[PDB]
Amino acid sequence: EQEAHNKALNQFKRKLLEHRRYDDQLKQRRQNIRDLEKLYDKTENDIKALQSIGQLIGEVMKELSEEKYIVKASSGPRYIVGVRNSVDRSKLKKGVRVTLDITTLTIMRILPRETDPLVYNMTSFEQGEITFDGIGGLTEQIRELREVIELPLKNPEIFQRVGIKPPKGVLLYGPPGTGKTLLAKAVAATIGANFIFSPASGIVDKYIGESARII
Amino acid sequence: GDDELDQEILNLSTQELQTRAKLLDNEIRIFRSELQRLSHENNVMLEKIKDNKEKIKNNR
Amino acid sequence: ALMYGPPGTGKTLLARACAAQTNATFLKLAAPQLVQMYIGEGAKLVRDAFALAKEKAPTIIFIDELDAIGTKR
Ligand SMILES: Nc1ncnc2c1ncn2[C@@H]1O[C@H](COP(=O)(O)OP(=O)(O)OP(=O)(O)O)[C@@H](O)[C@H]1O
Numbered sequence: 001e002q003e004a005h006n007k008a009l010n011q012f013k014r015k016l017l018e019h020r021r022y023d024d025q026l027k028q029r030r031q032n033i034r035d036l037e038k039l040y041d042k043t044e045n046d047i048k049a050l051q052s053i054g055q056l057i058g059e060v061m062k063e064l065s066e067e068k069y070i071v072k073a074s075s076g077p078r079y080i081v082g083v084r085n086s087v088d089r090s091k092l093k094k095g096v097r098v099t100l101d102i103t104t105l106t107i108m109r110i111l112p113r114e115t116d117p118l119v120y121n122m123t124s125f126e127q128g129e130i131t132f133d134g135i136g137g138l139t140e141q142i143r144e145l146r147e148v149i150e151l152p153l154k155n156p157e158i159f160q161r162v163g164i165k166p167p168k169g170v171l172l173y174g175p176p177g178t179g180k181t182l183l184a185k186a187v188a189a190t191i192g193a194n195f196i197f198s199p200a201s202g203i204v205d206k207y208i209g210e211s212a213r214i215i
Numbered sequence: 216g217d218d219e220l221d222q223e224i225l226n227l228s229t230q231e232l233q234t235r236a237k238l239l240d241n242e243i244r245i246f247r248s249e250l251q252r253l254s255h256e257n258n259v260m261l262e263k264i265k266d267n268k269e270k271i272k273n274n275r
Numbered sequence: 276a277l278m279y280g281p282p283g284t285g286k287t288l289l290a291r292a293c294a295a296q297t298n299a300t301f302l303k304l305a306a307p308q309l310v311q312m313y314i315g316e317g318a319k320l321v322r323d324a325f326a327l328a329k330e331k332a333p334t335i336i337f338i339d340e341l342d343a344i345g346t347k348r
Pocket residue numbers: 128134135136176177178179180181182
């Protein structure tokens with residue numbers, strides 16, 4: 001050393017480190033409460049759903065009277081049910097899904113439409129892609145195919161000039177292996193419009209009458 | 216650390232560093248106080264998650 | 276891969292021997308059992324035999340006798 005008063009700074013260096021080490025414990029704890037904060041909210045949201053109850057969906061089958069509506073439920077049997085002042089008469093039309101309670105059966109709100117669990121599986125097929133010329137020599141068949149398909153879809157407006165009925169529907173036929181499904185995938189990709197891709201037998205059900213409902 | 220060492224005998228007088236340590240007395244008693252304040256709070260919060268989570272466990 | 280030839284040639288026995296030997300998952304499936312008169316859910320037996328298989332991939336779906344769902348007509 002330099003001094004025997006450097007024996008007194010040996011002890012004072014420690015105090016300094018302690019003070020710069022308790023500040024980082026003060027940042028530790030402010031990070032520890034905000035980590036527990038989210039865990040309270042993650043369970044607070046579950047409380048709020050839990051002390052609530054479910055809704056049971058209907059749709060407006062027919063208007064009867066001001067405060068009385070006839071619905072046909074998605075589970076089946078028709079009811080007459082009431083309305084809160086949480087919905088308007090000018091905000092209801094038929095085939096519009098409505099909520100009901102499962103403890104009083106009264107509409108509180110307007111509900112968007114429903115759509116099959118089955119048809120969402122078809123929009124998740126898009127693989128098997130190929131380019132716009134992806135069938136060799138059958139490129140002529142692509143031209144025939146788009147005249148019904150791609151051109152009026154994009155612009156109906158040039159077919160007003162022609163004056164004919166709106167083009168609809170095509171049959172592909174030929175022995176197996178000729179890329180009928182491949183041509184299907186190729187006109188799905190290139191147009192890029194919403195696309196399904198329905199299995200023949202994933203639109204059949206055991207019950208004869210649900211098989212009709214899907215399509 | 217950066218202060219109260221053999222570097223700062225050269226630069227600054229030695230009663231300066233004598234009095235430094237007694238200001239770090241005053242400053243670290245405040246710093247320890249606030250550390251326990253934010254410690255006591257987390258023990259209550261943990262219990263209020265439990266009170267919520269018990270309900271969730273019956274459903275579970 | 277198709278196996279074919281007269282009855283008794285050894286086809287079934289191979290299939291078992293190799294799938295267990297290399298440790299590729301061997302699903303045991305018989306063709307008429309997919310034909311059920313619950314059809315739509317019996318057609319969903321077919322769907323689920325692929326559903327299992329895509330999680331249990333790679334996997335070998337050995338269908339014994341393919342003239343019920345391999346019909347000409
Ligand atoms: N006409 C074709 N030109 C080029 N490649 C083809 C053609 N047809 C089939 N392929 C190739 O064969 C693959 C599988 O054939 P795909 O499943 O399209 O058969 P398909 O005979 O059209 O079906 P289906 O028997 O159900 O009508 C394609 O992904 C593609 O690689």
